[PDB]
Amino acid sequence: DIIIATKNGKVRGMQLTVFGGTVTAFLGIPYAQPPLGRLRFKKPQSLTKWSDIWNATKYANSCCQNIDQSFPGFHGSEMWNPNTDLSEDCLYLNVWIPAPKPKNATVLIWIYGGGFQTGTSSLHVYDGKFLARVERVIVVSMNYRVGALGFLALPGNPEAPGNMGLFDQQLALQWVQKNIAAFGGNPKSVTLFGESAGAASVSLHLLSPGSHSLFTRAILQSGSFNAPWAVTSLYEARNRTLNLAKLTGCSRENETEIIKCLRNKDPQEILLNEAFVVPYGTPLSVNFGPTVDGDFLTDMPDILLELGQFKKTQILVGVNKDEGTAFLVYGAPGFSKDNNSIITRKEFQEGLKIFFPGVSEFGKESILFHYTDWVDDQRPENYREALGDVVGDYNFICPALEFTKKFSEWGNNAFFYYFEHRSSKLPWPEWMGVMHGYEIEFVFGLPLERRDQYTKAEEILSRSIVKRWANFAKYGNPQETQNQSTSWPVFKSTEQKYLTLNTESTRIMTKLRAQQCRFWTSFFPKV
Amino acid sequence: DIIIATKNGKVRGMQLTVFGGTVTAFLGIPYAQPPLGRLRFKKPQSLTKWSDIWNATKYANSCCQNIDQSFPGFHGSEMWNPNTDLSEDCLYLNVWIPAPKPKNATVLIWIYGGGFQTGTSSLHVYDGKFLARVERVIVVSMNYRVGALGFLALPGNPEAPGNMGLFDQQLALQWVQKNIAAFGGNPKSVTLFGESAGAASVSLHLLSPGSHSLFTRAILQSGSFNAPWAVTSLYEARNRTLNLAKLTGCSRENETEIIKCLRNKDPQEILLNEAFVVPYGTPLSVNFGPTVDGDFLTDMPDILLELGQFKKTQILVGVNKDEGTAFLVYGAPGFSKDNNSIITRKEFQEGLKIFFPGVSEFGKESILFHYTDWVDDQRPENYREALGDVVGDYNFICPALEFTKKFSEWGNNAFFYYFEHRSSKLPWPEWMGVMHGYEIEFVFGLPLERRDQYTKAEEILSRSIVKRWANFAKYGNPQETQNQSTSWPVFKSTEQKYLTLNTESTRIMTKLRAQQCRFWTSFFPKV
């Protein structure tokens, strides 16, 4: 029986058998007042404290969210859907600790992705028990509000100020500062890690003065705030809040009255109308996302980054070889997970309309010109591959690289990876390659489980990744020092060295997507 | 009576009074066999030698060429038209020497512009008597063949090998090497200078192994071989030669027979058909220009420049503030030298069609996007100014800057100027500004003549320019060392310092047209 006394009460955890050893899991610890009734759309409020023992023995409710119903019965999409009941009562976190209890362990805090619209910490690919067992780190993950319930903004108004989901995260970081020593954790050694919107979130905690003293270091997998999907403008937010109001019968003259009306709606009515708050959307739409609220974010985050206004610490950042492919089957014509998706020039052009809904004709033409100078072959898969790269480069790779360049310019050590291994178990077709989201299982050590039918090369790759992430968290340096591994060099603005991650041979390379990112980064912000 | 014994015979010159002093002029010395009959389209042949005295007492015939008839009676255009009879018998040069005869004077050799289609050394703005008088340099200038008669190419065929006009120039440089000591000149101190196509020519002598030992240093005013108008492709040349053949009734199966037929045509029939050898032309058309002949030019000159295959010496290069404006009244809709030429967006778009006849729609749109981001005003002269800058930047400024960057990268001192003074006497309207061609009169010292109604500030500016050019020719360093002048810094690829030339204040500036040239240089060669 494992009982830990926290600041707000006692919690009971449970023992898990992992790799002939033991891990203690505390699943579903509350970290804030349930944001119900009048607390809907507000910043999370602190917890009241309890006598008796909270049983943290199962994963808690996931936050309200729409679900991916595109491919019922299909593991590739369904694996990302929530696996616990949905509820507004969802502000809970999970703690995995090694056994025996550690003395002063480094802490890894996971922040999930899902476009700020979806996600939960209870997914099987975020199970922190392997990391705890193998590296003797403590792993923490939290549920934070998503969609309108987490990000609705009527800027400056404390009834709906925006960024609530980010304040949920921040309050979980505070819980860790205050409570993790009780669990054998070192609050002075805390590394945030996250993927996609989780990685964007981690990058915003780097920018937020309120988050400064709540963590040590940061890991950004496939995401950063400067991605074009990551921050909603005040103009967009206002329009989208007002659209939601109109759609739910909540239009009012008085804005505080709008919010009052919205707090009376069933959460299901809110979810149902989220997709419609924009005239046109893309498979990458973030209808309700982070905004400049003058609280969590004091200024436009691009300005903050450019001018060095961020936490000075080490970062580990990376992307996957085929970031863009996953999104192509959610609306690009000619694409299907169930065939090789050879598309024509015309289909490619229609695809750009899907992903760049406007975007001038000139803008779309410039994309076409840059990405379809076939050298050369023809080569039926030309257009198919081009559209994937457009989407991955614009949305994930070039922003991650620009983030890393601009961050490192202020003197800190940054390390960049390019993940190029496709899971032997991937249920998506071969043409999709090394997909967005599919490094996560390697980071969390799932291929370390021999019962699981990953290859031996995958076990080795995962073990190596796990060691490098742990060494980054503990020591600020993502090396694997014992098995004559390639040294991961620091990424600097001149030279821009990065490390490739794959089963055959780890390589030091330079200037990832140099030509492509010159297009997106230097030219396309104008168009 | 002034008689000089040359390698090929005695020449008599004439005495000129200049600024209360004397200059000896030898106008119209032959330097090659007249390229008539069977010598038409061939490289120039050496001169036979003569007894008795050649009277070099007037300017010789100008080479056959079409004339600018756009504005009869108008000095601004007519000043560029030939002022001596046109003849195929035109291979003559001029020598001005100070009096008393110098002992070992530095030599400046002028190569005129005119798009390789027109020009003559006898123009009043190329009169070398002021330079000789004021700086005690020797000035030489030659007539070289222009148009088809100078540049017709059927590559590899000695009957019409291309580049004949460039070999004319080269043979005049040889004449100088062999003869200038007789006139008090130093063949080891020879500086080439030229403007527009003359400057492009100077840059090609830098690349030509045959010209290497024929000069010391080089000055490039408003031109360089990498300008888009400066070198004809082998494909274009062949098509244009064949088109000329078709147009003159000279189409044949045998190519040597084509040339034989062309040698029978009256030169007037050739001139008449030159404009038509291309389906569409621009006000900047160079129908018959330099080509890669494997003789004068051994490889594509861009490759030679990139890879450092050129004469290692100092260069002085520059451009005028409004290079592009002169061409706009030769076909852009809405433009007139006789009004302020306020054009609309649609007219601007039509203008691009005139100057970029194809050039995809995307290409033309990209130009529009880059040059019409009004910041901001509106501001009726927006489009008018934009089209001038497009034409000047693409055709003259960005190529001159890229030439200077690439040249200086191989270790030599380069000096770059930006000429921003508009002649008080300019007969063109004010909207045309600091025009192409209108620094030349300042270089040649015409404003030093007080009788001429230039301002006092212009006399001073000209005197300063003349000293800097002379110091560049004599010493490789374009300084004016005596009157507390701004030091002209070396232009280096990092930093890219240049000197502005104007009547108020000479400034050291950096990175001329940085944004515009990034567009033309990095992006537009693709489109």
Ligand SMILES: *[C@@H]1O[C@H](CO[C@@H]2O[C@@H](C)[C@@H](O)[C@@H](O)[C@@H]2O)[C@@H](O[C@@H]2O[C@H](CO)[C@@H](O)[C@H](O)[C@H]2NC(C)=O)[C@H](O)[C@H]1NC(C)=O
């Ligand atoms: C801001 O919102 C307006 C209105 O959005 C419409 O009504 C909402 C309640 C919701 O149902 C949306 O899906 C509707 O589009 C947008 O105005 C629309 O713009 C499109 C242009 O693509 C136009 O064809 C529609 O007719 C407009 N609808 C109305 C009612 O005027 C507007 O585009 C949004 N502003 C943005 C995105 O900046």
Ligand SMILES: *[C@@H]1O[C@H](CO[C@@H]2O[C@@H](C)[C@@H](O)[C@@H](O)[C@@H]2O)[C@@H](O[C@@H]2O[C@H](CO)[C@@H](O)[C@H](O)[C@H]2NC(C)=O)[C@H](O)[C@H]1NC(C)=O
């Ligand atoms: C190469 O030349 C051909 C033929 O040129 C035509 O005939 C010549 C004698 C002369 O009179 C030219 O002005 C004529 O254009 C070009 O073929 C023409 O191309 C245009 C496309 O703009 C087309 O509309 C015409 O019908 C074509 N004319 C013929 C007779 O076929 C061709 O464009 C040139 N190649 C180039 C510029 O690369």
Ligand SMILES: *[C@@H]1O[C@H](CO[C@H]2O[C@@H](C)[C@@H](O)[C@@H](O)[C@@H]2O)[C@@H](O[C@@H]2O[C@H](CO)[C@@H](O)[C@H](O)[C@H]2NC(C)=O)[C@H](O)[C@H]1NC(C)=O
């Ligand atoms: C790959 O499949 C796509 C997607 O749509 C199809 O999925 C197939 C697996 C099959 O079940 C089929 O019935 C289903 O429609 C194909 O694109 C479709 O092509 C048709 C032409 O008949 C269009 O009318 C559809 O709109 C279009 N769908 C989409 C979403 O664009 C695609 O042709 C196929 N590609 C191959 C075989 O290379």
Ligand SMILES: *[C@@H]1O[C@H](CO[C@H]2O[C@@H](C)[C@@H](O)[C@@H](O)[C@@H]2O)[C@@H](O[C@@H]2O[C@H](CO)[C@@H](O)[C@H](O)[C@H]2NC(C)=O)[C@H](O)[C@H]1NC(C)=O
């Ligand atoms: C400036 O003049 C141009 C050029 O053409 C005109 O020149 C004038 C000085 C005058 O002699 C006039 O008769 C002559 O046509 C004007 O552009 C012209 O505008 C007319 C509209 O009637 C068009 O039909 C012509 O095609 C067009 N010419 C060209 C070459 O494009 C221009 O409008 C005028 N601009 C002003 C006053 O701002």
Ligand SMILES: *[C@@H]1O[C@H](CO[C@@H]2O[C@@H](C)[C@@H](O)[C@@H](O)[C@@H]2O)[C@@H](O)[C@H](O)[C@H]1NC(C)=O
């Ligand atoms: C736990 O260790 C603390 C020091 O942590 C280390 O130094 C900080 C600055 C970070 O770099 C972190 O990564 C390191 O692990 C001590 O202050 C603290 O007292 C320790 N607590 C114990 C032993 O109970």
Ligand SMILES: *[C@@H]1O[C@H](CO[C@@H]2O[C@@H](C)[C@@H](O)[C@@H](O)[C@@H]2O)[C@@H](O)[C@H](O)[C@H]1NC(C)=O
């Ligand atoms: C003329 O002077 C010659 C040297 O010229 C100088 O050095 C060369 C290399 C160039 O740098 C040039 O600019 C200089 O002016 C002598 O070789 C030659 O003999 C002199 N001739 C005379 C005095 O009759």
Ligand SMILES: *[C@@H]1O[C@H](CO)[C@@H](O)[C@H](O)[C@H]1NC(C)=O
């Ligand atoms: C928590 O679980 C333990 C089972 O060991 C039980 O004793 C206790 O009553 C539980 N508390 C609950 C369900 O509230």
Ligand SMILES: *[C@@H]1O[C@H](CO)[C@@H](O)[C@H](O)[C@H]1NC(C)=O
């Ligand atoms: C390093 O090597 C050992 C022994 O060969 C192996 O068991 C382990 O998996 C490797 N460690 C890491 C961190 O990759």
Ligand SMILES: *[C@@H]1O[C@H](CO)[C@@H](O)[C@H](O)[C@H]1NC(C)=O
């Ligand atoms: C050259 O000019 C002089 C005039 O001084 C004259 O003596 C001589 O005969 C002339 N030669 C000609 C015209 O061929």
Ligand SMILES: *[C@@H]1O[C@H](CO)[C@@H](O)[C@H](O)[C@H]1NC(C)=O
């Ligand atoms: C320098 O100054 C003198 C005397 O003031 C003047 O006559 C001359 O024009 C100037 N020289 C140059 C080369 O500009």
Ligand SMILES: *[C@H]1O[C@H](CO)[C@@H](O)[C@H](O)[C@H]1NC(C)=O
């Ligand atoms: C609108 O008036 C109501 C009246 O109760 C009140 O909530 C508030 O003062 C007003 N709204 C705002 C946003 O100030």
Ligand SMILES: *[C@H]1O[C@H](CO)[C@@H](O)[C@H](O)[C@H]1NC(C)=O
């Ligand atoms: C074409 O034949 C003629 C026959 O006299 C001759 O000039 C030459 O050998 C041929 N042309 C070429 C270019 O070889």
Ligand SMILES: [Cl-]
């Ligand atoms: Cl098309």
Ligand SMILES: [Cl-]
């Ligand atoms: Cl338009």
Ligand SMILES: [F-]
């Ligand atoms: F590794």
Ligand SMILES: [F-]
């Ligand atoms: F000066």
